[PDB]
Amino acid sequence: ATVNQLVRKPRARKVAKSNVPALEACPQKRGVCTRVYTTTPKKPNSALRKVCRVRLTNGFEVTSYIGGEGHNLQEHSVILIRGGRVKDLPGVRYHTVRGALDCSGVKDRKQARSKYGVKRPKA
Amino acid sequence: SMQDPIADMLTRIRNGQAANKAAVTMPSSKLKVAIANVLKEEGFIEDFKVEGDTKPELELTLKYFQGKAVVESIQRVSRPGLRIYKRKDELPKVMAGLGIAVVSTSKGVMTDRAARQAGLGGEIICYVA
Amino acid sequence: KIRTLQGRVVSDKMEKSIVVAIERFVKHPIYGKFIKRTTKLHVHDENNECGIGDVVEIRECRPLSKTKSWTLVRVVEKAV
Amino acid sequence: MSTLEQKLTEMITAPVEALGFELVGIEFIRGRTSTLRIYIDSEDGINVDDCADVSHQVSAVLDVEDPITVAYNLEVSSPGLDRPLFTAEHYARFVGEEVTLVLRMAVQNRRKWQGVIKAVDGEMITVTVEGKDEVFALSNIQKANLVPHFA
RNA sequence: CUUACCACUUUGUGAUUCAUGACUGGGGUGAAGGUAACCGUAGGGGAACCUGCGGUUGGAUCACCUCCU
RNA sequence: GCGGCCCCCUGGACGAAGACUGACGCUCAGGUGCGAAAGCGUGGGGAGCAAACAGGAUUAGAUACCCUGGUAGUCCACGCCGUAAACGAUGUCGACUUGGAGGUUGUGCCCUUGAGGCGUGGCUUCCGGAGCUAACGCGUUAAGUCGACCGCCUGGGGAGUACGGCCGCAAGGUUAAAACUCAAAUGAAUUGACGGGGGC
RNA sequence: CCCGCAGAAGAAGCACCGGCUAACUCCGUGCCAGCAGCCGCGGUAAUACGGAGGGUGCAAGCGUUAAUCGGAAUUACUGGGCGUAAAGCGCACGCAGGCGGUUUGUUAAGUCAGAUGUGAAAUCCCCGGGCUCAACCUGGGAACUGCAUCUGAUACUGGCAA
RNA sequence: UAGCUAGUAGGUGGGGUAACGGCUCACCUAGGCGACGAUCCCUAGCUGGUCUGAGAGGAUGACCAGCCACACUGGAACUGAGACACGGUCCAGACUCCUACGGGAGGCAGCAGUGGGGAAUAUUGCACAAUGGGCGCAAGCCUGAUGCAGCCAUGCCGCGUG
Ligand SMILES: [Mg+2]
Ligand SMILES: [Mg+2]
Ligand SMILES: [Mg+2]
Ligand SMILES: [Mg+2]
Ligand SMILES: [Mg+2]
Ligand SMILES: [Mg+2]
Ligand SMILES: [Mg+2]
Ligand SMILES: [Mg+2]
Ligand SMILES: [Mg+2]
Ligand SMILES: [Mg+2]
Ligand SMILES: [Mg+2]
Ligand SMILES: [Mg+2]
Ligand SMILES: [Mg+2]
Ligand SMILES: [Mg+2]
Ligand SMILES: [Mg+2]
Ligand SMILES: [Mg+2]
Ligand SMILES: [Mg+2]
Ligand SMILES: [Mg+2]
Ligand SMILES: [Mg+2]
Ligand SMILES: [Mg+2]
Ligand SMILES: [Mg+2]
Ligand SMILES: [Mg+2]
Ligand SMILES: [Mg+2]
Ligand SMILES: [Mg+2]
Ligand SMILES: [Mg+2]
Ligand SMILES: [Mg+2]
Ligand SMILES: [Mg+2]
Ligand SMILES: [Mg+2]
Ligand SMILES: [Mg+2]
Numbered sequence A: 001a002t003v004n005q006l007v008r009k010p011r012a013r014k015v016a017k018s019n020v021p022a023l024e025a026c027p028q029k030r031g032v033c034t035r036v037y038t039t040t041p042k043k044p045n046s047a048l049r050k051v052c053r054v055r056l057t058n059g060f061e062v063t064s065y066i067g068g069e070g071h072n073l074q075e076h077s078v079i080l081i082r083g084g085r086v087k088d089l090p091g092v093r094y095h096t097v098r099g100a101l102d103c104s105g106v107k108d109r110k111q112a113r114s115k116y117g118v119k120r121p122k123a
Numbered sequence B: 001s002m003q004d005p006i007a008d009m010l011t012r013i014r015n016g017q018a019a020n021k022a023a024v025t026m027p028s029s030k031l032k033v034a035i036a037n038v039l040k041e042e043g044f045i046e047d048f049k050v051e052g053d054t055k056p057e058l059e060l061t062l063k064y065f066q067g068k069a070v071v072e073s074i075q076r077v078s079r080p081g082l083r084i085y086k087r088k089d090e091l092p093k094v095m096a097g098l099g100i101a102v103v104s105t106s107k108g109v110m111t112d113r114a115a116r117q118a119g120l121g122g123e124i125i126c127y128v129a
Numbered sequence C: 001k002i003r004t005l006q007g008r009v010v011s012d013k014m015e016k017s018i019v020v021a022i023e024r025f026v027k028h029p030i031y032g033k034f035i036k037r038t039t040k041l042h043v044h045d046e047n048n049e050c051g052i053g054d055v056v057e058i059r060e061c062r063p064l065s066k067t068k069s070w071t072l073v074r075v076v077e078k079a080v
Numbered sequence D: 001m002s003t004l005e006q007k008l009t010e011m012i013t014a015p016v017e018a019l020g021f022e023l024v025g026i027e028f029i030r031g032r033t034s035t036l037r038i039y040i041d042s043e044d045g046i047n048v049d050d051c052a053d054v055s056h057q058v059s060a061v062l063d064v065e066d067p068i069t070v071a072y073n074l075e076v077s078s079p080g081l082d083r084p085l086f087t088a089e090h091y092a093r094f095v096g097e098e099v100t101l102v103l104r105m106a107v108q109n110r111r112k113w114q115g116v117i118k119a120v121d122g123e124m125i126t127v128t129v130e131g132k133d134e135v136f137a138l139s140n141i142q143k144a145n146l147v148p149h150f151a
Numbered sequence E: 001c002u003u004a005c006c007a008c009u010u011u012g013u014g015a016u017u018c019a020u021g022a023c024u025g026g027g028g029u030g031a032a033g034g035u036a037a038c039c040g041u042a043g044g045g046g047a048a049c050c051u052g053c054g055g056u057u058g059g060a061u062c063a064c065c066u067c068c069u
Numbered sequence F: 001g002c003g004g005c006c007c008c009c010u011g012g013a014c015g016a017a018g019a020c021u022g023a024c025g026c027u028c029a030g031g032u033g034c035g036a037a038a039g040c041g042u043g044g045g046g047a048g049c050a051a052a053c054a055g056g057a058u059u060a061g062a063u064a065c066c067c068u069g070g071u072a073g074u075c076c077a078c079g080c081c082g083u084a085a086a087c088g089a090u091g092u093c094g095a096c097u098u099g100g101a102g103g104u105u106g107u108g109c110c111c112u113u114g115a116g117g118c119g120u121g122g123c124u125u126c127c128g129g130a131g132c133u134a135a136c137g138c139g140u141u142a143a144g145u146c147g148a149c150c151g152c153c154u155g156g157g158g159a160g161u162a163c164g165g166c167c168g169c170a171a172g173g174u175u176a177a178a179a180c181u182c183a184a185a186u187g188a189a190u191u192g193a194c195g196g197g198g199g200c
Numbered sequence G: 001c002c003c004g005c006a007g008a009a010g011a012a013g014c015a016c017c018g019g020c021u022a023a024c025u026c027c028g029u030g031c032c033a034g035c036a037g038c039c040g041c042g043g044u045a046a047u048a049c050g051g052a053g054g055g056u057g058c059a060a061g062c063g064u065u066a067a068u069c070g071g072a073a074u075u076a077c078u079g080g081g082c083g084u085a086a087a088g089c090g091c092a093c094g095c096a097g098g099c100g101g102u103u104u105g106u107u108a109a110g111u112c113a114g115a116u117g118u119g120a121a122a123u124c125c126c127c128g129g130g131c132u133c134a135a136c137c138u139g140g141g142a143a144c145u146g147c148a149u150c151u152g153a154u155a156c157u158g159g160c161a162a
Numbered sequence H: 001u002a003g004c005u006a007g008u009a010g011g012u013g014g015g016g017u018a019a020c021g022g023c024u025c026a027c028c029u030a031g032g033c034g035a036c037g038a039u040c041c042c043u044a045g046c047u048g049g050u051c052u053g054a055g056a057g058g059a060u061g062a063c064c065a066g067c068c069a070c071a072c073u074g075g076a077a078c079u080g081a082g083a084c085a086c087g088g089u090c091c092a093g094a095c096u097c098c099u100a101c102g103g104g105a106g107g108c109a110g111c112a113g114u115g116g117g118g119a120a121u122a123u124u125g126c127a128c129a130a131u132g133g134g135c136g137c138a139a140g141c142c143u144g145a146u147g148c149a150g151c152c153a154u155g156c157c158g159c160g161u162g
Helices: A003-008 B004-018 B029-041 B112-118 D005-018 D050-062 D090-094
Strands: A026-038 A051-056 A061-065 A078-082 B023-025 B057-061 B074-076 B100-105 B109-111 B122-128 C006-011 C015-027 C035-044 C055-060 C070-075 D021-027 D036-038 D073-078 D098-103 D114-120 D124-129 D131-139 D141-147
Touching: A026 A061, A026 C006, A051 A078, A051 D050, B004 B023, B004 B029, B004 B074, B004 B122, B029 B057, B029 B109, B029 B122, B057 D090, B100 B112, B109 B122, B112 C055, C006 C035, C015 C055, C055 D036, D005 D021, D005 D036, D005 D050, D036 D050, D050 D098, D090 D114, D098 D124
Parallel strands: C035 C070, D036 D073
Antiparallel strands: A026 A051, A026 A078, A026 D073, A051 A061, B023 B057, B074 B122, B100 B109, B100 B122, C006 C015, C006 C055, C015 C035, C055 C070, D021 D036, D098 D114, D098 D141, D114 D124, D124 D131
16 A cells, blocks of 8 residues: 555566476377276266376376267377367366377368368369 | 645635635735735736734735636645655646646745756745646 | 775674664665665774764775774764 | 175176176275276286276166266276285285285284285285285185285 | 685574475265244264254245348 | 442543643553453352252153152352453444434533523434445444554355464363365345235 | 570468457358367357358468466555445553644755756667668767765755744 | 675785785774665576657667676686687596496587477588688688588568569
């Protein structure tokens, strides 16, 4: 309030932590999957939230969402995750990058091919 | 306790002309009359006067144009809490120069426009549009 | 003519020395309230002449102890 | 208590062996977001796409035979590197691998130890902790998970 | 050749810590009825709830189907 | 917080009229002090009241509900605790700014004074003007217009919790987290369902 | 760098098109799924999912992620609050501290004015110059708000005196 | 994280240094320092600047320039104008290496480059023509400084794909 108070104690800049800790500011962080699993939404909706359990290189073991379909991943697959989060499923703050060297790119995609590594069709 | 005359001089004007009074009185002092006259000498107040012997009374005459108070905003900038001083090049502006700022330059208390012509910096007393 | 600086003596207990608290009053970097800032300067006082709380003028010289690099030119007031 | 877990295992045994897959890992825990986890031990490879076919099959049978006090939160799951093993078939296949085992009635010097399997019995397992092979009775052990060597 | 200094070391003796890890404080946890709300405290005790004292009014609950200027 | 009467000890406020000193002031981290009730220590004391408890009445079960008991306590002495919706949910000091109604305690004047008429203070209650406010409202006792200084807030939960420190005999208090969790939480008012009510 | 040669000849893609936000239809689709930055989207009609046409945006790039500042007046110096939304300690006294009526004199500390010194170059900015343009490079200047010292000025603040 | 400190604060004397000085000794005194935050733990090379912002700010310290510190780890001096010395010396240690096993040798945080780490970062190039630096009368010699090239849409700017 009164500056005399501020000179006694100035305006502390409100600290703000990052929302993606297992990244440590590296825009991508590879890790090896440990167990994949789908989970069921509650009674009203039936769906397969595809997420997998992955230990990071730096021991941060976390789960990563598996976007798209036709992925042939299973335990020991060595994938690469990146920032971003899904509002519907809690506890998922990371998504893999489709078209990773271990990942097999989603097949039969004719649009948004940069978000899946689906190369320009030879045509 | 009271710790600033000028502030109380100002608000007495503000709250005074707020009540649309005719003329508001307060104990006199050099700075005050020094301040007060600059208003009239600028046209902010009609006129003022000092009354009593061994007792300080300042009675200044306000003014209204078209039923509207001639002064509308008056803010003491330099406060007894925090003091404010500005170099000549840096003397502020009020409403793009439509308003006047009272600055206590070393030679004398005066208008910031005159102070810029005098090329002198001073303590910014207050603002008035 | 010479750089000189005046301070009040916090202590004279030191043998042939004095502790002088000099006050300097400043615009404040963020806000602008002028606050007093004091330095516990160690000062060489010959004769153990001064007394605690006196006001005194001081000038700097070649360093003389681990902490004393200043000596007193003269005293302003006295009889504290 | 088993919340009809054997009955639920019988209910979900028919679909898991229906699309041919292999059943391990029955678990359920009620609470906020109450959830059960079902594991498919696929020798070919537990892709979530393979899991997807099993998951639609198990939900379709499950809705008619909804479990008592169990919400619809199934986790069709790959048994990870730290898959939990409860039957002696596991430790049988898990011949010489380490496992961490915790039991219900905790006591001083209880069998809460992590070590390598050397022998397998129907109600007992021999596992090398304390630097010596020691008897473990899975009768009191309600939780036990196979461990890969790591850092 | 010896004196002082002193790296490393060793002995114990501690602390500060950093992990690993056996073990334990605790957020979530798998009907006869009498109903303002509350606060401080005490006791009943699974706890809660009710009761004891004193204080306050803050002296009601609920709500889901479209437009171009 | 204070409630019979009387005495003894004493603090503070107000007014009238001067006289007096000569800015001696305001705020307050730290700091001491006071501090409802309950509780604690020791000794009391003991009517009434009454946690707990005891009994009587009453369903998976009496339990709760009610009686009838009833201990601690409630009181005193001296310690200890230091928290309350300790709230006006409004820090302290000053100055300024429309009114009407009151209560209350002064005191001047003047009617013939009682009365009554004029005044002029302090405290206090209530409307309500400008104003301000998210609104409700507040509105010369401002939540208005200003000043000086201090305390304090920074989404909700987690949590006034953990740890540590400090205080206490304890009870505990004070100081005060984070992990994690949520996309809200909340304030006022607006319109409608309550109501199955209440009246016509 | 110039001159010649031949011939359109060797050289376009990513994203998006429910809202925010520029840009819409058709079939799929059957809560299967997907989509997601969020609000939200989805069933017999889905401009929000897949595909096709069509369109927008950029462009040898276009996107996504990370990351910092901005937006955020959301630590509010500039520039917030504290009757009920988070927030006035239970109350008081009081040291340190902060602040202080009025008049004159003095002081010159604050402050202001000037001057000198310094504030590396680059960078920034102005006015140029040079690369065919541009980036880039470069001349000169400005600026570097500071600091120190000397001279000042005395209204205010402070000090000192009354 | 509230106390901190005994060569500690000061003094005398001696020594010591290019020079001041608890620099160090001898003694003398018993101070000094802290809420204007000592002490402690934890984090961090600093600045010109860069980024962001209308500004104030906030964030930053990659490249270029200034300063500092470091050169396997620990310790030490020697020489020299200048070193307690990156491609110098000695001791200790770890490691690697050689061995005749007796002992020895070694230090890419120079330039390339390898391994590894990692989401991820290049050539074991040319030349000393220019500018610089060393030595030298000079000639000249040396120079992974530097000048150039290679690599990479990493960025900016320009142009084309009629
Ligand atoms: Mg499916
Ligand atoms: Mg009360
Ligand atoms: Mg009591
Ligand atoms: Mg009961
Ligand atoms: Mg008692
Ligand atoms: Mg309280
Ligand atoms: Mg007020
Ligand atoms: Mg899409
Ligand atoms: Mg801001
Ligand atoms: Mg606010
Ligand atoms: Mg509330
Ligand atoms: Mg509140
Ligand atoms: Mg004080
Ligand atoms: Mg003062
Ligand atoms: Mg004054
Ligand atoms: Mg420059
Ligand atoms: Mg330039
Ligand atoms: Mg040109
Ligand atoms: Mg004066
Ligand atoms: Mg000496
Ligand atoms: Mg650097
Ligand atoms: Mg660099
Ligand atoms: Mg030498
Ligand atoms: Mg060398
Ligand atoms: Mg080398
Ligand atoms: Mg290298
Ligand atoms: Mg690698
Ligand atoms: Mg050579
Ligand atoms: Mg290019």
